[PDB]
Design an enzyme around this catalytic site. Sequence first.
Site, PDB file in Angstrom:
ATOM      1  N   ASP A 126       6.005   3.669   5.169  1.00 44.58           N
ATOM      2  CA  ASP A 126       6.614   2.475   5.520  1.00 44.58           C
ATOM      3  C   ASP A 126       6.584   1.290   4.313  1.00 44.58           C
ATOM      4  O   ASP A 126       7.222   0.261   4.599  1.00 44.58           O
ATOM      5  CB  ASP A 126       5.862   1.971   6.835  1.00 44.58           C
ATOM      6  CG  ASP A 126       4.501   1.773   6.781  1.00 44.58           C
ATOM      7  OD1 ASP A 126       3.966   2.602   6.446  1.00 44.58           O
ATOM      8  OD2 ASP A 126       4.161   0.533   7.204  1.00 44.58           O
ATOM      9  N   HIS A 163       0.728  -1.298  -0.022  1.00 44.52           N
ATOM     10  CA  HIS A 163       0.095   0.018   0.074  1.00 44.52           C
ATOM     11  C   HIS A 163       0.885   1.367  -0.118  1.00 44.52           C
ATOM     12  O   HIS A 163       2.108   1.302   0.234  1.00 44.52           O
ATOM     13  CB  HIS A 163      -1.146  -0.087   0.991  1.00 44.52           C
ATOM     14  CG  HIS A 163      -0.630   0.357   2.363  1.00 44.52           C
ATOM     15  ND1 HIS A 163      -0.109  -0.626   3.436  1.00 44.52           N
ATOM     16  CD2 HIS A 163      -0.261   1.404   2.994  1.00 44.52           C
ATOM     17  CE1 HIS A 163       0.263  -0.088   4.518  1.00 44.52           C
ATOM     18  NE2 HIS A 163       0.143   1.144   4.321  1.00 44.52           N
TER      19      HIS A 163
HETATM   20 ZN   LIG Z   1       0.252   2.403   6.329  1.00 43.49          ZN
HETATM   21 ZN   LIG Z   2       2.193   0.841   8.792  1.00 47.02          ZN
END
Ligand SMILES: [Zn+2]
Ligand SMILES: [Zn+2]
Length: 219
Positions: free
Chosen positions: A82, A78
């Site tokens: 991170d 996604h």
């Molecule tokens: Zn996230």
């Molecule tokens: Zn995350």
Amino acid sequence: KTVIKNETGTISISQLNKNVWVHTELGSFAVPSSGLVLNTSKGLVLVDSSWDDKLTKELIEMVEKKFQKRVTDAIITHAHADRIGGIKTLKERGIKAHSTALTAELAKKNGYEEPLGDLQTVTNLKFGNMKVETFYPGKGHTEDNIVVWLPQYNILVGGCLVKSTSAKDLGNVADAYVNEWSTSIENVSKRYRNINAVVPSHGEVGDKGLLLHTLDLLK
Ligand SMILES: [Zn+2]
Ligand SMILES: [Zn+2]
């Protein structure tokens, strides 16, 4: 089990199989972020990058040396930092960055560069002797989030969609869909039975039990 990190301390990797490894980096706020390293006959595959290009490069260089083979592909679950923070690096070095069409869009929105957006609700990828399935179960941690499944070892990569046993919070939910989040988790448990191990983007690795836990937090 074995743990080995670079001579800076930034990056650490840990083994699960003759073929599967888990990379972990920090982004002080220190908040560990984890993904996978697939060691295949035809190259190395990263599941999710890291907070920034700085750490991404440091990682590749590390594993590419350790395994003496190129990182050919990466998979982005996604469009958050991170997960996608090293997208600029991947594209510099000619690495294939796979993603859903949606994840790709949301990357543009968040000031990052765009992955391929070539994955479907269900996509079956093969890198040498390694089979990899990407699955979009629905909205949750974000609306674009997906999971990765490794049929040969029955390993599931939860990403930020699954909370670790140590996670008491839901973390940030600015972009989360807290109602569909539960359903999506159902969709995963339905699709994958006999789960050998589950990998959370933040926290220690667990089993089918982390799914039930995440559901607990959504109550
Ligand atoms: Zn996230
Ligand atoms: Zn995350």
